[PDB]
Amino acid sequence: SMQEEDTFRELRIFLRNVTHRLAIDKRFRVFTKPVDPDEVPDYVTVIKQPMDLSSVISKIDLHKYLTVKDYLRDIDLICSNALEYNPDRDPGDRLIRHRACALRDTAYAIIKEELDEDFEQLCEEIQESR
Ligand SMILES: C[C@H]1CCN(S(=O)(=O)c2cc(NC(=O)CN3C(=O)N[C@](C)(C4CC4)C3=O)ccc2Br)C1
Known part of the structure; x- marks a missing residue:
């Protein structure tokens, strides 16, 4: 339905906003771009x-x-x-791991404070219905 399409559009707007807030945090600059091959x-x-x-x-x-x-x-x-590619005790690796863990913790914390559980539940039930 258009109502279901409107639900997924709201999910995309919400996810773009969370991702933007992670991407502008100077701690997470390394994670904003793919690894240069x-x-x-x-x-x-x-x-x-x-x-x-x-x-x-x-x-x-x-x-x-x-x-x-x-x-x-x-x-x-x-x-x-990040934990897999940078596992060593050296400060360079430890800084990357701390920043990776912080990026994850920050994402979960934003979602805990700002995601309506009934909104996630509706997304899950539309997804399952397809
Ligand atoms: C090579 C390591 C660095 C950290 N990890 S990571 O697995 O945590 C990871 C990295 C990235 N992106 C980048 O590293 C993008 N980038 C480069 O390729 N070079 C510069 C300039 C800089 C690194 C020297 C840089 O920022 C994305 C995701 C992960 Br999970 C791989």
Whole structure:
């Protein structure tokens, strides 16, 4: 229905706003762009599902997220990919992991404060009906 289409359009506006607020935070600058393949050629071999906030925006605009749960799976993926590629005790790796964990925690905290549980539930029930 047009009412269901209006629901998913509201979800996209909400997800763009959350992603924008993460992307303008100076802590998260590294996560705003895909890994430069000329700068880091082995990334695409080690990390099987690369994800970054620019790709998250692309996926919102392509209607790939029908629930906030599906969006948070991609936020979780930025965090897990960061922990996987940068696992060492050195401060460079530890800073990336702390920033990755913070990006994930911030996304979940915004959604906890600002997502209506009944809105997510409606998205889930429209998704399941298809
Ligand atoms: C190579 C490491 C860096 C951190 N991780 S990550 O897995 O946490 C990760 C990185 C990225 N994007 C970028 O790194 C984009 N970028 C570059 O390719 N080079 C510069 C200029 C800078 C890094 C030297 C930069 O910012 C996106 C997502 C993750 Br999860 C991979």
